């Protein structure tokens, strides 16, 4: 159903799925904060954190670009944890902006 999509995706598309997934979970968490639903907020921020960690851990550190990507992922991870602790939707909008930057840029990059 969605199993097929991950298995037919190119490596570039798999990464793009992760960026889009991270955005979805951040947005779900921000709505849960507005709904005063701490339980749903946390579930979605943990899922967003886990995607950022997967991206970081699958960086090829032999490639020079990885250093700056990894520094951003480390910040984004810490900022999502702080947003969970502080119930701060402004921190979520901040990280949403960075992930959108990566996502939009990655989508252009995988064109060819």
């Amino acid at each position: 159903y969605q199993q097929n999509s991950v298995n037919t995706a190119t490596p570039g598309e798999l990464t793009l799925m992760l960026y889009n997934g991270c955005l979805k979970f951040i947005r779900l968490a921000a709505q849960a904060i507005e709904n005063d639903d701490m339980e749903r907020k946390n579930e979605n921020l943990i899922k967003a954190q886990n995607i950022i960690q997967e991206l970081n851990f699958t960086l090829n550190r032999n490639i020079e670009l990885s250093a700056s990507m990894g520094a951003m992922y480390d910040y984004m991870y810490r900022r999502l944890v702080q947003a969970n602790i502080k119930n701060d939707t402004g921190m979520l909008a901040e990280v949403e902006g960075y992930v959108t930057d990566f996502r939009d840029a990655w989508k252009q990059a995988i064109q060819s």
Partner: protein
């Protein structure tokens, strides 16, 4: 080489699960804290209504005081509602399920957070009953006597009793409300102390994983992160083939799990 990678992967995953556990725990504590903030606000409104009803020289018992009492009873029903409905993953946090049990300690239920990956690394949390019959003037043994809980308030009694009348005069019923406010405040403060401990635990776990993985953790403020994000975006654009080599290294099964 295999022994080092296995030890490191086990350390990382242990830190990750401890952090998930601790964030789950802080989100349960926040659920209780938010509910008790509402209980506290309701109690402050009840207090205003008791002060209003104390002006018995200008208030009529069967109209004005009964009308105030009807509003107080609706507000204490809401306190009871909060105490009965507040839940995290189905656990009733505020109805006394998790209270400290002096009289029979084997009956005590605790909220347990496994905040590290090893033996004994738990925090055990109790929450008292925050229902209206459990808030008010407490006896030496922690029970509440007849007429001494928020559920027993009846401001129509002010019409026929001086303010210093035992149990039912204005002064005594106001004392019930003020003791209830102090008890809810105390419970909120105790949960806040747990939240502070969990925050420190989570931040230590994050820092430990960063040191273990040699993360670049130098970005420490919003404006710097914004600047570095624009830099990284531009380099993904300008070096697309390098970006693919750097990042396009996931396994499909991991991606499926992460998108659930």
């Amino acid at each position: 080489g295999l022994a080092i990678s296995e030890k490191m992967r086990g350390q990382i995953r242990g830190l990750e699960m401890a952090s998930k556990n601790s964030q789950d725990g802080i989100s349960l504590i926040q659920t209780a804290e938010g509910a008790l903030t509402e209980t506290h606000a309701i109690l402050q409104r009840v207090r205003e209504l008791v002060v209003q009803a104390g002006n018995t020289g200008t208030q009529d018992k069967a109209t004005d005081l009964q009308s105030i009492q009807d509003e107080i009873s609706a507000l204490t029903d809401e306190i009871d509602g909060i105490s009965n409905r507040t839940e995290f993953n189905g656990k009733k946090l505020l109805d006394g399920t998790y209270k400290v049990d002096t009289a029979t300690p084997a009956n005590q239920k605790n909220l347990v957070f496994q905040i590290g990956a090893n033996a004994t690394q738990q925090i055990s949390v109790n929450i008292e009953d925050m229902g209206a019959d459990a808030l008010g003037i407490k006896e030496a043994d922690g029970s509440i006597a007849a007429l001494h809980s928020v559920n027993d308030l009846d401001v129509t009694k002010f019409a026929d009793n001086a303010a210093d009348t035992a149990d039912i005069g204005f002064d005594a019923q106001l004392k019930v409300v003020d003791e209830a406010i102090n008890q809810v405040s105390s419970q909120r403060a105790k949960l806040g102390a747990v939240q502070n401990r969990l925050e420190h635990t989570i931040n230590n776990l994050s820092a430990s994983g960063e040191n273990l993985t040699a993360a670049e953790s130098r970005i420490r403020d919003v404006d710097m992160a914004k600047e570095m994000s624009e830099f990284t975006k531009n380099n993904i654009l300008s070096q697309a083939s390098q970006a693919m080599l750097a990042q396009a290294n996931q396994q499909p099964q991991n991606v499926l799990q992460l998108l659930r």
